[PDB]
Design an enzyme around this catalytic site. Structure first.
Site, mmCIF file in Angstrom:
data_model
loop_
_atom_site.group_PDB
_atom_site.id
_atom_site.type_symbol
_atom_site.label_atom_id
_atom_site.label_comp_id
_atom_site.label_asym_id
_atom_site.label_seq_id
_atom_site.Cartn_x
_atom_site.Cartn_y
_atom_site.Cartn_z
ATOM 1 N N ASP A 260 0.852 -1.174 0.000
ATOM 2 C CA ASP A 260 0.000 0.000 0.000
ATOM 3 C C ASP A 260 0.902 1.243 0.000
ATOM 4 O O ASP A 260 2.123 1.133 0.127
ATOM 5 C CB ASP A 260 -0.956 0.000 1.199
ATOM 6 C CG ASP A 260 -2.248 0.750 0.912
ATOM 7 O OD1 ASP A 260 -2.279 1.522 -0.071
ATOM 8 O OD2 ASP A 260 -3.228 0.575 1.663
HETATM 9 O O1 LIG Z 1 -3.882 4.884 -3.969
HETATM 10 C C1 LIG Z 1 -3.214 3.659 -3.673
HETATM 11 C C2 LIG Z 1 -3.625 3.193 -2.275
HETATM 12 O O2 LIG Z 1 -3.554 4.288 -1.368
HETATM 13 C C3 LIG Z 1 -3.720 3.787 -0.043
HETATM 14 O O3 LIG Z 1 -3.574 4.861 0.889
HETATM 15 C C4 LIG Z 1 -5.085 3.110 0.147
HETATM 16 O O4 LIG Z 1 -5.129 2.494 1.432
HETATM 17 C C5 LIG Z 1 -5.283 2.028 -0.920
HETATM 18 O O5 LIG Z 1 -6.591 1.458 -0.833
HETATM 19 C C6 LIG Z 1 -5.066 2.689 -2.280
HETATM 20 O O6 LIG Z 1 -5.279 1.750 -3.335
#
Ligand SMILES: OC[C@H]1O[C@@H](O)[C@H](O)[C@@H](O)[C@@H]1O
Ligand SMILES: OC[C@H]1O[C@@H](O)[C@H](O)[C@@H](O)[C@@H]1O
Ligand SMILES: [Ca+2]
Ligand SMILES: [Ca+2]
Lengths: 742, 739
Positions: A260
């Site tokens: 993430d």
């Molecule tokens: O944007 C990419 C990622 O950002 C993260 O902060 C979120 O938890 C994810 O769900 C998201 O896909």
């Protein structure tokens, strides 16, 4: 074939070029017209970039891809990812709302249409679906998921993966999916985003894991790590999780793992050490791609020279990334997803919006309907009141980064369109979102603004009352703003904002029949509303077509058929409260609150306000008695369970028939019930149909104390109804077959 | 004739049925004085079917019942007599949560000593105490019976409690056998609802919940009681891993017996574990020795033995353990050891015992706010005392006080008038009932703990108090919970002061007079609005039989408040569970920066609790100098000396609780932002300075890692010292291992 071509590729690569494949950096701004001299360009040229994300438009993506194709040493094309969560430009309802359709056909379709639009715009990889089970309405990310149930969750996860990925990765209409967030992200403590997670191994396997597993078994191409720790180790560096659980049967997953957003770097904050240390931990754990943080890019080589990682570990991560790009068709055509004509003609089309309008109307949950208030007659005068009555950009809800927010149909818009010359629609603001402007501000980030009235609340309330007094019925559009949920949108208070409740009260006090049309991204505490409001329709956030879809329901064009996928508590004091719970050793008998020395509170019943699976209709459904093919089974037999469902009300409509199974005794305690099947059936007024389920021992299996997956001989209760609460049932006995004990 | 020989000789004489009978702790039924030997329980004792009895009161009744076993059973095996002696016998000390706030282990131990003295004098030789369940959930009524959220402070109080009860010899007639409960994890019931499901990782158990139980065992507690909750899907009572592998893990041997909670075995049927025979056998196999009330052992063990579902050895081992406790308590030398009428006449609820309770209670109060020198009150002018808790005796001891002289407690009105004398005029007014909703008042005041109820409209009764208040120079509002609003099966989904009382408080504030909120509660409450609007807040928990006098000692400044919270006070129930020893997360919100998008935080409330762990004010002020460390670079098993100058920079003599916290910055697993690792309560005359010193070693650095190995890891640590878990002086060090 693929395997020979990729080994050949990797044979030409330097260490730095392999490392570079593992990098998923932020792009920074890219000036259309000079992409090849932009910030990201230099890194692409040196082979330091494996992919990018949240870059939008085929025109821009095409010129960035050109840098990799024409200007890097090996010409390795990039992945282009994006958060396509519930639609691309056409917004379907938020995931939680989509879950309440209980219609896996509709759900797979929405994913299909979303992948058709994204892929038509140069996107080949989506960060979806999120399948985190959660029992905590305080968590803003409940909106991104599909409720508290592992079975329903697993079915939806399958539908979503199948929708995006289609029949072949190499289709220019199919994109790669990414199941997130592995894992247990939904159990963050106190419903506060990113907070500590902790649970037993056996709970993980029975209660939280199944949705992730269904995505993998459905063939999902990638997996995204979660922000939370588990057993005191952040998911992103958790080798047990990413390697032992995720890749246990060798051939099972086969895809790649992305972190993430800066999740590796954040392990520093967690308390796991410096960037090099946590980067190395992530690689050894089984992480393949590093999102934004560049810990891999900057530290892997050093760790390798220091003996902290191995060459084989780097090669294996790099291999996976290449294999993904190979599957997507990128090596045979780096521009496969870059066609200006597709983007012009296949996105946000009238057909696409229509389908979304149809789907949205199937997601609504009718929580109350006293005295036939709904459906509304299309005649007389109707007063629409509230801060959500006439707004466009909030309709798509959160996680709609590519949505046409400003082209969305407001509720006022759809209502006037539906009413035509037959009924007059009156509008009034009633009140702002909340009494606290700073809360409003932070709840309406990312351009999702609500028009703000500077006047004293009493002046504005009186304004709405005067209008309402001129109407025959009042439609109150209340609830949350779009960004009151989503990421980093936790609420310690899960009621409708107080100001709006004060408004609602003033409306009720007019004596006019009131319909509460509720906009939310989460379950809310609604006991007082349920006590006082004649009708309540939960519309979640319906997408770009909200106004039209809602009007379909309100006037009875579509008969509400949605059912809760998460429990609605009486107050945040009950959380976590869920349907698949253990009995405890001192259960409160039904209807007996309050009893001293049972498991119950002094000040609130044990029951939630609305249970899992709850959903009303404009019509009524009657269930006959549960029919079972046998009450004594042995070994791998099939039990047939059937029941008569009759449309005994005044309208055509659909109802969701739900199958629950209870294992009475076990070597460990078993849930008082678990969803194990369902079917959505449409019935003409007065029509009767026989609904049939096929149960086998597979449906009876669980993870025991030793984490062995199996069923145990004994008594079971088979239950069927349109609720986790209101059921017909019958007990059976199921034995093992000595001959087949292996 | 030492214990082992005697017990073996005895068991050789016993029938199977007599061995099984020793495992039975039944409910006694009513017993008519003067005809005990022909009473309901009498036939069972005669047949040898009774190993012990509990919650029977008075030496007269107990001697007679014991005479049935001694004179009318075949082998003359005497009974154990147990009771819930939780926070005093007849003299009631504050509830345990209140007691934990003294942070004074001497007072804790003394309170338990006095309890043992009273209980033993009245025939009791066994108490179901201490309750040492860690809890982070204020909804749970039973937080009142425990010592808060911290494993360390909890472990210390557990030791103090066990020593106080047991003394140095089980055979003293002033010592009684203690019983640590509830093994285990009972305090993590989901959603704060009593008896509800518990679930958590092994590593969380070992670091965060187990330490108090282990402390009790290591202190030599004689018995352990099982808990009602499941763990990993198996009820504690039938959980062999817990009752055998953890409890009786070879090294650190627990040598006592295990007793179930109230019908805990039978309830495993409801849990979903099988029928009575099945769950009984499961319990015996797990390591359970004595069966409270449910008679699963009595009525099913023989059948299981015949069917080979259990073994003779399992029954023998359990029986032996019961007989050993009796032997240790001196019951085989003198079955009537604890039955002396003269002791009971002279050693219970004495004037001396009551005085000690008064002194100890006053040291348990937590001053949560004191703006503009409102406290201590001057003993002059007129004082208005208002609220549902201002003039009630029976509620003062709080919950879990079954033997307490409730009707002889000192009400706040009474205590105030007494301390005032002719120096000050105390006016009184009801103000409001406990709550709107009479039916809630009723279930909250069971067990004869009734409050006066006023049928008059709330506005009338408020106007009455406002008019009285308007005649005084200061208002003292006695508000909060009733006694039985906490305790067993007293969970609240709402942890505020009842709304009616807040509406009263609002009215009192609006008079313009200074208001002092004297708060009664068995649990942390959400007090944000009160903290913002009330000049002074004194948390007095439930103080016991002497409540009124102890509270007056504080109000007038006879005693300077010195308590510290042992549990976090949240801003709202939406923050729960909120606790001081938490992990950092990967997206921590910097201090003072609420609100930040994409940090770990709420849209609608700050991350901070209202009052943190270790919080407590004084009538005076304490100033800490800078933290002095003997070294910032340590190697192996060295001793680190941490010292700090503490100064009483205020206007009154008083004591403060100096607290030691340590942070392990980097671990192979994530480590808490801080953990309590030491404390000292020190008294300082006005203007006096003292050097407070701690001595730290690697033992203070150890924890259970991912593999459950107990050890410390080399690296950086932060050492922190202050009177509060939030306001700290600190200094970073490096501690290395050696070859
Ligand atoms: O944007 C990419 C990622 O950002 C993260 O902060 C979120 O938890 C994810 O769900 C998201 O896909
Ligand atoms: O009264 C005996 C036992 O009763 C149970 O219900 C409580 O949980 C124990 O704390 C108590 O010791
Ligand atoms: Ca079974
Ligand atoms: Ca360390």
């Amino acid at each position: 074939k693929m395997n020979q071509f990729i080994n050949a590729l990797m044979a030409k690569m330097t260490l730095d070029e392999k490392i570079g494949q593992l990098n998923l950096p932020g792009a920074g701004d890219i000036t259309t017209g000079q992409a090849s001299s932009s910030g990201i360009a230099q890194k692409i040229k040196e082979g330091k970039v494996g992919g990018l994300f949240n870059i939008k438009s085929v025109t821009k993506i095409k010129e960035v891809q050109r840098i990799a194709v024409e200007e890097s040493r090996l010409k390795i094309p990039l992945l282009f990812g994006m958060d396509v969560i519930h639609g691309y430009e056409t917004a379907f309802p938020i995931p939680l709302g989509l879950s309440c359709t209980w219609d896996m056909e509709l759900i797979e379709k929405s994913a299909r249409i979303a992948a058709i639009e994204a892929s038509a715009d140069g996107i080949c990889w989506t960060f979806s679906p999120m399948v985190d089970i959660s029992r905590d309405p305080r968590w803003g990310r409940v909106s991104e998921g599909s409720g508290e149930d592992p079975y329903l969750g697993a079915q939806i996860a399958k539908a979503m993966v199948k929708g995006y990925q289609g029949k072949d990765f190499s289709d220019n209409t199919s994109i790669m999916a990414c199941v997130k967030h592995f894992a247990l992200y939904g159990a963050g403590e106190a419903g506060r985003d990113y907070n500590t997670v902790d649970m037993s191994r056996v709970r993980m396997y029975n209660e939280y894991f199944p949705p992730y597993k269904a995505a993998v078994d459905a063939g999902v191409g990638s997996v995204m790590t979660s922000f939370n720790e588990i057993d005191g180790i952040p998911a992103t560096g958790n080798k047990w999780l990413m390697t032992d659980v995720l890749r246990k049967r060798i051939g099972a997953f086969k895809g790649f793992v992305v972190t993430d957003y800066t999740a590796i770097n954040e392990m520093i904050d967690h308390g796991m050490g410096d960037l090099q240390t946590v980067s190395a931990l992530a690689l050894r754990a089984g992480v393949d791609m590093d999102m934004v943080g560049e810990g891999f890019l900057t530290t892997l080589k050093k760790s390798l020279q220091e003996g902290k990682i191995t060459q084989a570990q780097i090669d294996a991560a790099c291999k996976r990334i290449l294999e993904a790009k190979y599957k997507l068709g990128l090596f045979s055509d780096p521009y496969k997803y870059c066609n200006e004509e597709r983007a012009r003609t296949q996105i946000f089309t009238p057909e696409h919006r229509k389908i979304a309008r149809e789907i949205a109307a199937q997601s609504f949950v009718l929580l109350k309907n006293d005295n036939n208030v709904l459906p509304l007659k299309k005649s007389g005068t109707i007063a629409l009141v509230g801060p959500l009555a006439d707004n466009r950009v909030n309709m798509p809800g959160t996680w709609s980064v590519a949505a046409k927010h400003a082209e969305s149909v407001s509720l006022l818009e759809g209502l006037k369109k539906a009413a035509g010359n037959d009924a007059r629609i009156l509008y009034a603001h009633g009140s702002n979102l909340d009494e606290d402007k700073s809360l409003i501000e932070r709840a309406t980030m990312f351009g999702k603004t609500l028009k703000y009235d500077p006047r004293p609340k009493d002046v504005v309330i009186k304004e709405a009352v005067d209008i309402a007094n001129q109407a025959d019925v009042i439609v109150a559009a209340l609830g949350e703003s779009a960004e009151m949920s989503g990421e980093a949108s936790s609420r310690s208070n899960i009621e409708i904002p107080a100001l709006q409740r004060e408004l609602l009260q003033a409306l009720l006090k007019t004596g006019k029949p009131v319909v509460l049309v509720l906009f939310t991204g989460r379950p809310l505490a609604l006991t007082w509303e349920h006590e006082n409001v004649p009708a309540i329709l939960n519309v979640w956030f319906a997408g770009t077509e909200a106004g039209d879809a809602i009007s379909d329901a309100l006037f009875g064009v579509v008969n509400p058929s949605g059912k809760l996928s998460a429990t609605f508590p009486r107050n945040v004091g009950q959380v976590p409260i869920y349907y698949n719970h253990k009995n405890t050793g001192r259960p409160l008998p039904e209807g007996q609150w309050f009893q001293k020395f049972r498991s119950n509170y002094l000040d609130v019943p044990n029951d939630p306000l609305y249970p899992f699976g709850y959903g009303l209709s404009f019509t009524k459904f009657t269930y006959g008695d549960l029919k079972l093919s046998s009450t004594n089974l042995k070994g791998n037999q099939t039990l047939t369970a059937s029941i008569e469902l009759t449309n005994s009300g005044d309208y055509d409509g659909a109802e969701v028939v739900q199958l629950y199974i209870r294992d009475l005794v076990g070597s460990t305690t078993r849930p008082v019930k678990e969803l194990k099947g369902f079917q959505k059936v449409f019935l003409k007024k007065g029509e009767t149909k026989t609904i049939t389920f096929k149960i086998t021992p597979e449906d009876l299996k669980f993870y025991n104390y030793d984490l062995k997956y199996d069923w145990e001989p004994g008594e079971f209760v088979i239950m069927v109804g349109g609720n986790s609460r209101d059921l017909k049932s019958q007990k059976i006995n199921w034995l093992k077959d000595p001959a087949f004990l292996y």
